[PDB]
Design a protein around this ligand. Sequence first.
Ligand code: CDL
Ligand code: PEE
Ligand code: CA
Ligand code: CA
Ligand code: CA
Ligand code: CA
Ligand code: CA
Lengths: 246, 246, 280, 280, 280, 280, 280
Amino acid sequence: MFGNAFGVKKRRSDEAEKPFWISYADLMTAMMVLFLVVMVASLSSVTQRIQRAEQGEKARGQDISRLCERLELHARNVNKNIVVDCHDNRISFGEAGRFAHNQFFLNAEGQKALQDVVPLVLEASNSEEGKKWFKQIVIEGFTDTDGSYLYNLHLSLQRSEWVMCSLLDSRSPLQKNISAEQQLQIRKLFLAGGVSFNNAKESKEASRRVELRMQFFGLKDKRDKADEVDFPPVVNKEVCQLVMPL
Amino acid sequence: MFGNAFGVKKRRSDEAEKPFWISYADLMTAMMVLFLVVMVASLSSVTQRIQRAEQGEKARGQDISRLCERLELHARNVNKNIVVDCHDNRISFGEAGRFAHNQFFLNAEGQKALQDVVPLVLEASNSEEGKKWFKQIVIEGFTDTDGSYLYNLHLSLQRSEWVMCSLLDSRSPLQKNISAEQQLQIRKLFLAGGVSFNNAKESKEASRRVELRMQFFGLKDKRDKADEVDFPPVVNKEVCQLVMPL
Amino acid sequence: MSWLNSILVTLTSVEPYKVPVTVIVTVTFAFVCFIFFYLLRSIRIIYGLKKYTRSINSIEKSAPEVQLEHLKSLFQRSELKHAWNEFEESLHSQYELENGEEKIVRIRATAPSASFFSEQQLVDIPLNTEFFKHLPGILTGMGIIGTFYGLMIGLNHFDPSTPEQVSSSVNNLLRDVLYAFLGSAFAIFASILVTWLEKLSIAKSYKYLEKFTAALDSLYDSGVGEEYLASLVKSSNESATQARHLKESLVTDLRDMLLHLAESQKIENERLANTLSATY
Amino acid sequence: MSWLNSILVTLTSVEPYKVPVTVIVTVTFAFVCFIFFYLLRSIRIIYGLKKYTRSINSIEKSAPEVQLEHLKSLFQRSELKHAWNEFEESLHSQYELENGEEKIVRIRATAPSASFFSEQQLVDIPLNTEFFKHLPGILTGMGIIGTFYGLMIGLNHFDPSTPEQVSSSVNNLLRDVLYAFLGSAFAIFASILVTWLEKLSIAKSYKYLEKFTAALDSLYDSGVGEEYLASLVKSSNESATQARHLKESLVTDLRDMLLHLAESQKIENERLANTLSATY
Amino acid sequence: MSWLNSILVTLTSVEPYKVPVTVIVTVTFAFVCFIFFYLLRSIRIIYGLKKYTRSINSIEKSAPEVQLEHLKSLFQRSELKHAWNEFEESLHSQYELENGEEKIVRIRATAPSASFFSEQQLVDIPLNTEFFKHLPGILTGMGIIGTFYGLMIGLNHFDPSTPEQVSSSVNNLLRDVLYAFLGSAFAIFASILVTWLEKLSIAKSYKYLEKFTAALDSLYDSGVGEEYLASLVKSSNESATQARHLKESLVTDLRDMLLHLAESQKIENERLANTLSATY
Amino acid sequence: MSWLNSILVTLTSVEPYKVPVTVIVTVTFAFVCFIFFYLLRSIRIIYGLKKYTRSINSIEKSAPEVQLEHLKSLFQRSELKHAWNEFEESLHSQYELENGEEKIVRIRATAPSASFFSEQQLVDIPLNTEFFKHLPGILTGMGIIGTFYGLMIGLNHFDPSTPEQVSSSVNNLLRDVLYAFLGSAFAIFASILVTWLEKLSIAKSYKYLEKFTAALDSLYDSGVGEEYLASLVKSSNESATQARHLKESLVTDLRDMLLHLAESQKIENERLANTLSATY
Amino acid sequence: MSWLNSILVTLTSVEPYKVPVTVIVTVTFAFVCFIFFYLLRSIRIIYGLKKYTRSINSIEKSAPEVQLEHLKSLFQRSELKHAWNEFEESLHSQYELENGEEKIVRIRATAPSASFFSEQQLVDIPLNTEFFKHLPGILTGMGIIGTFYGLMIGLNHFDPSTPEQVSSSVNNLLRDVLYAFLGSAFAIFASILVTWLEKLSIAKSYKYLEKFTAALDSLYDSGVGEEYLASLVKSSNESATQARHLKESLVTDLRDMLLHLAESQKIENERLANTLSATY
Ligand SMILES: CCCCCCCCCCCCCCCCCC(=O)OC[C@H](COP(=O)([O-])OCC(O)COP(=O)([O-])OC[C@@H](COC(=O)CCCCCCCCCCCCCCCCC)OC(=O)CCCCCCCCCCCCCCCCC)OC(=O)CCCCCCCCCCCCCCCCC
Ligand SMILES: CCCCCCCC/C=C\CCCCCCCC(=O)OC[C@H](COP(=O)(O)OCCN)OC(=O)CCCCCCC/C=C\CCCCCCCC
Ligand SMILES: [Ca+2]
Ligand SMILES: [Ca+2]
Ligand SMILES: [Ca+2]
Ligand SMILES: [Ca+2]
Ligand SMILES: [Ca+2]
């Protein structure tokens, strides 16, 4: 009967977010971040030696690729006969390097290409990339498994000896375009010898070929100085001992 | 003034809990646990790969060392002039391996030791260590730095060819001693390498020498039929190419 | 305890795909219940409130009896039937005398119509808002349970023995948690949608309930008790003044009547004197 | 500090399985207490409200005294006994003098039935809603405590210090995490189940209490003070009117009596004149 | 289930950068909707409330009829027309008969203006504050969905098969985590900004609504019912005293008039005696 | 700047154990403050309410005055003394003229006792529930801050510069995480315990305050205003007939008195005529 | 997308140390705004309330007019001035004739003092509690935002190209996580400090406002309307009795005057008889 019309009531005051839940979300996010970053740091620490070795391997690959590309660019510029396989470090003279049956010489193009490529490879080896990663050059010999074994071995050995003669025989056209230091460098960077058997090609005429396969230091080799030897200055011109007239 | 003091009260509907920060906190709890588990699992796994690679490399090295040790023990048991160096994987000849000027054949002791070491190498490759790691054997020629370079190369290469013949010549005792399978295995193992000129100490007696070294598969190397060149069965005897009046 | 290991291997033996499908099916059934019992119900409530408001606005100019009968015929849904009955109890009909009869000339309001057509009675109880406002939290909790269950399935099957086992176990754990989070994300999306739909529906229900009660309030005027008190005060003052005026008028009339009586008795005394003189 | 290290070795010394077991057992105890003190109690309240509503509907068309006696005998549970006593105090009994005695002809409402059969007194206090609406939060927090303490155990065991025993540390960590998440998931499941049950029960309690108070409100009509004020205003107006008419009627009666007195005086005067003439 | 496997494989193959873009687009759309439907409307409501308050404060010292006409004109072309109509119904106009015409001399408040210009019908319903207090949570839920999904994608792609693959796996994982963190940072920033803006605007709205309803209450005074009751009590006491004094005054007047009538009768009878003596 | 690095060197220089100890100490101090200022206070309030209910349930059969002085002497608290004074102001004492004096016969309640012995005045303000309902959030925040600070210490200690130092660094960081989690777990356990006790105390206090006010409400009866209005209406209705009957009785008495006056005049003037005739 | 990468480069381009600095400075600015706009105002309000309570308690034993003047001069703040005006016009002043002018002898309370000096009017709106109760959540959210932003900067600038680049990037990531921990710790610390200060201030404000309104409530008594109605009922009964007694007294005294008139007429007629006898 005598109620107060002016009695007021509090509004619909919705409460705030409970601070615990947002703080807990903050803490859980911080913990998730901590575990992520600790995993990243730990994995980067355990494998840092592996990472450094892989980086060095990639750098060696880049240097070798650059040197091979420079050498093959020089070959393309100078002589079309010289084709370079940078994938597996092979110098090929396919058409000019064919060997007929039971002979160890080559046509004129074989010698032209060989005596043309030797100075180019010497120049490549004399560069800083060569002075850091280039070892001596291996002459590749190939023989088939048919017939008498030792006849094929003797044929390949005579082919290698003929290649080395042609590189370092008197009156050769290369000898007229060479200096003493370059001749010494050829003597140091080249060894003649090596035989192999393979069945990766469809024709037996392919095995009758010669190739240049340069090989490089490993990452942990790093040009052991004690391995290098020395030769005296040339006192008399070299003479090939294979039977040229045959 | 006309209202009633006995009126309804508590007209206040409770506010519902805000659920989304709760979801955020619980999902980050799950994510934090996931990241912790991935952290520990990834660290353990990477460490296990690293130690597995290290112990595999160590086991391969130990197998190589055991093979070299047993081969050297067998060499001592057979005949004493053999010199085996496990530190560089090289079997050399102490004195019987010497050579004189314009000479291309080992002495009687040298030929005897060369014939004796072959079955030891066959047994070494036969064993489990040989099957697991043993590569083909190359033959390296060594000669002084003096004289004609082509003369030295031809002489050393002739020495290597004569050694290979004595390995596989029909008149040699090996052919009448070994079987067809042993002959094929020798064909697979023994290869001719290059010529080296490691001249030191001004000792021509020990500089001009030939020794055989064995190579081994790497940890990452793969064994496949492409590299496994199979010689056909022997259908005719082999006569060597360098005749005695040479 | 062996009981804990047994229940763990029992719980975690379910296929990891059965967690998201269970969460999705449960959340979808809760969503369908929400749609049927709250969204459709509130849409019907809003439509009915709009129709009732239109009906009430059409009797603004009618006579009090006619519009009272119209409103009595209008309200037949049980909650609004009771609400209208109590509201009409609150209305105060004022009668006047015309042609020697008591008929209603004006109906006055004593309480606002929102007191009887209240938000509770007409919206909150029908929509079960005391329950359905907590549904988003329930959906979120179901999603969280699904994610935790998937994580538990992935963790129970983890094998850290060998590195290959470690990698496969990590893949399986991530796959199980991914299934579970599919279910959980569905739950959170449904929670968002339910929150939006619920809040919008309740806001519009309150809006059109306010419009309906506003239409009902405009028919009847409040403030009748103060008018009655003012009328009583005026009547008291007039009664005092009229008491004095009637006393004065009665005194005047009494004086006039006694003067008339004195004149009449004087005339009769003269007549008696004349008769006595005649008898002499 | 020796104290804190001793505290850690004491906490982490418990077997990890006792953590989810403790969480599950205590949360199940909380759920059982909720069922006993809130759910079954609310079911009993709802059934009682329905039965009371049925009883009230049976006396819709009875005499006010019979209705009052039936309701007094009906309400005997303590809180509804007090609520009914207060509500009956709110009711206004209108008496009329019939057959020489005062009899209750009508009982009028002055306040709504909800003012005494309030949601608070009849639902919220008997069900302890001020506590139970916070129970789901307590359950979720208990699950969270189990989660921290289980991960503390797991992090404590993780200390391999040797590549050979890393697998065992990882396995133990996974097991402890699995225990912690089992506890947390069970706690969250129980919290959402409690939320479902309590909100559904409270909604139903409010709905049926609304029906009960609506049944009580339909017995008695309100608006009696305004009717009394209207009667007073009409009484004042007719009182002024009756006063003026009584004054006029008194004046008229006074005039009639005075003319009758004049006639009697005339009769006496003429008789005196006749007597004097006879004597003379 | 084949469908679940297809859904999982398609959800695993989603580009990681698309999840933050979706989060950003959806949160930006929600923010634009917030600005359009809440913030601009709240600004308009606040400006309108201030304009109304200035209009009300301009008639503080005006005549009551002019005040009523000004307020009716102010609120009649508005959505507050019915609220003003009810408030004016709650106003009690006191009348005094001046120069033979009934004129409004004072207007008395019988109810606060907050009961008609309520917060719900002026602020809460227009602004949809029921929903928009949940929008920060909605944005938080979008953020957690996007973040968990992105982190799951990142962990699924992270699998270093060899120790040489650790670097690339770490780099790609960090990129995926960066995308997930971008999404969450945007969503939570928008959540906090929405909270700040809408809380500040709702505080301003409540403040200016209070200023408005206080300006309305400042115009008119309350307590007229107690004044009427006090007047009635005084009038009753004065009426008892008045009745006693009117009775006494009527008695005195009647005594005086009867004495005068007796004197007149004595004079008339003395004249009769003189006439009788003259007749002798 | 260098300021940030300098402070980070400063903060992360403390031993990891000092942080859980600080968290435990501060949380325990806040829990003790809760127990003292809130729990014991609420227990004292509950026992006081129980004691007060017993006394009121003891004067239920005493005379209204004796009840009134008993209740006045019973309430000696500042909040309850003021509440009792206001409630007694709300009570309407009815006086009837007995033995020539005004004596209280009945005391009537005009407002419910809870309007003065309310929850805010008797529970919420004494217990500072506006503060203590937010204490658990404060406790959990303290724990989270301690956990964060311990995490900074642990992360500052973590630096695996060598592949062989990775396991030791990871284990030490997990130990620091263990410390931080210990702080958080204790804080959250204490917060849950505080929430449980605080909610239970509120529920008990509200229940017992309801019992107390119900005991107070039962002492006095309401509805005095409607009874007064019914009495006033009856008095006006009877007063109309009283005025009519008083007027009729006055007219009848005047008729009888004037008839007696006429008879007396007849007798007296007959005696006058006889005496005059005899003397003539 | 190009847009996403451009956004990432633009956002990440800031220095890592600017994120903790931004979080700390923004949180400190929010804290300073809280201190200036909430804490200092609340302290001023509490001090003013205590001073007003002392002033009101000093004026208890003064005359009603002096109390009104003192209280009118006391309240000068705009909200306090409006509240006092509303309360004063809710107060009922009782006037009595002492002895030639209207003098206030008592002032009665027709409404609680808290109806006008309410928490909403005097504390909640001036303190902007509708915004400031959500500030701690904003502070914690800014901490979370800083965490996410700092990690975004760390992750985007990760450079895996070279091993020492990896080492520097990992160091930057660790520093960024430490920075995020520091910012979160500071944000949560300021949030809980704001919560503590805010809740303590609001509780003290409610306590002292209750004391102040209790001081006002003690100055005046309630129940004036029931007393007026009781006076009216007693006056009606006494008026019935007085009307009957006045009729009885009037008829008795009229009988007396008519007997006196008859006796005077008899005596005067005896004198007339003597005169007539003297005539003869
Ligand atoms: C770029 C896009 C990318 C992002 C996409 C996703 C977006 C996420 C954002 C999250 C939420 C933010 C929204 C903020 C704004 C809304 C606030 C509000 O209340 O607005 C006021 C306003 C109404 O109040 P008002 O201001 O007074 O307006 C005047 C009235 O219209 C007239 O006055 P009246 O009161 O007299 O009117 C009578 C009243 C009473 O009538 C009634 O009966 C209503 C009561 C019940 C309502 C029933 C409606 C049911 C509709 C079903 C679903 C429709 C679409 C759902 C979309 C989600 C699915 C993916 O009628 C209504 O109010 C009905 C209008 C409501 C329907 C809105 C139109 C439908 C969709 C909008 C079309 C535009 C496209 C935008 C993008 C689409 C999204 C992909 O509502 C709107 O118009 C809102 C529309 C804006 C967009 C809404 C988007 C939906 C959000 C749902 C969450 C998504 C979750 C994903 C689901 C997946 C599950 C697995
Ligand atoms: C409204 C949501 C609120 C907040 C949500 C936060 C983030 C959650 C979401 C989502 C995924 C990102 C959206 C991507 C849309 C792009 C569509 C398009 O343009 O192309 C059409 C596309 C062709 O592209 P693909 O062949 O798939 O390219 C593969 C490259 N690796 O074909 C289609 O028809 C559509 C395919 C859909 C792909 C994304 C599916 C996402 C669906 C729902 C998301 C729900 C949350 C995620 C939970 C995951 C738990 C397992
Ligand atoms: Ca109206
Ligand atoms: Ca009713
Ligand atoms: Ca005012
Ligand atoms: Ca009572
Ligand atoms: Ca008081």
